[PDB]
């Protein structure tokens, strides 16, 4: 073609733009999850990062397959480290995610981050 610079390349990335949605409506997120799914049903652990009413704000939203609903986890910004509870922050989202992988998220019992939103996985693994 005449014009170039077309195509995104995000491999082996910690936080893919996929999870980052320009949708400030929790309700929408719930629909997307099931949408992006080829079986109209998201997988337990499906998490993402949407925006909030606030200016330049974000909120970690995870899919509670156990309850068949979505949660809300405000992502504050202190000392240049994203935190949800406070004293516990993370220089970068990536680290935070890895931390939760073993430390279930608050306001729940066994809600950990398995697979992000938008991103897709191969059947080989499973």
From Swiss-Prot:
Cysteines joined through disulfide linkages: none
For this chain, the Swiss-Prot or TrEMBL PTM comment says: Phosphorylated. Phosphorylation at Tyr-10 may stimulate the activity of the LYN kinase.
Name the organs or tissues of expression: Expressed in a variety of tissues including lung, liver, skeletal muscle, kidney and pancreas.
Report the superkingdom from the record.
Answer: Eukaryota
Q: List every position bearing Phosphotyrosine.
A: 10
Q: Ranges for the SH2 domain?
A: 19-117
What's the stated role of this polypeptide? Binds differentially to the SH3 domains of certain proteins of signal transduction pathways. Binds to phosphatidylinositols; linking the hemopoietic tyrosine kinase fes to the cytoplasmic membrane in a phosphorylation dependent mechanism.
Disease annotation reads: Cherubism: An autosomal dominant syndrome characterized by excessive bone degradation of the upper and lower jaws, which often begins around three years of age. It is followed by development of fibrous tissue masses, which causes a characteristic facial swelling.
Q: What is this protein called?
A: SH3 domain-binding protein 2
Whole-protein residues included? 446 to 558 of 561
